[PDB]
Design a protein around this ligand. Structure first.
Ligand code: NAG
Lengths: 49, 50
């Protein structure tokens, strides 16, 4: 018996799933996915810290 | 009997509201946003938003 325990936080990812990354596209209503954070919107360069 | 011999003139200020601010809401971007997976599910709840 193998028991796996998962933890999903705001920390950087260590164990991650196999997916083929694409090129970043800005100023366009697209569907994104960053760390399991799928959504819909436009991407714009930021100035936040 | 009592009868006045002089008088004064006063100015009184009273206030009362007339109107408020006009507001509007959009259900499809408040309840869901840009998620099309729950737009179809909100469509199954009838015509509350109308
Ligand atoms: C009535 O009141 C005004 C204001 O105080 C004053 O100027 C005037 O002299 C008064 N009238 C009399 C008859 O005293």
């Amino acid at each position: 018996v193998v028991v796996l325990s998962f933890e999903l936080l705001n920390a950087p990812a260590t164990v991650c799933g196999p997916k083929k990354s694409t090129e970043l596209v800005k100023n366009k209503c697209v569907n994104f996915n960053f760390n399991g954070l799928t959504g819909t919107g436009v991407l714009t360069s930021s100035t936040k810290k | 009997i009592a009868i006045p011999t002089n008088f004064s003139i006063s100015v009184t200020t009273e206030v009362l509201p007339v109107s408020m601010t006009k507001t509007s809401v959009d259900c499809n971007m408040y309840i869901c946003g840009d998620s099309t997976e729950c737009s179809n599910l909100l469509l199954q709840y009838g015509s509350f938003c109308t």
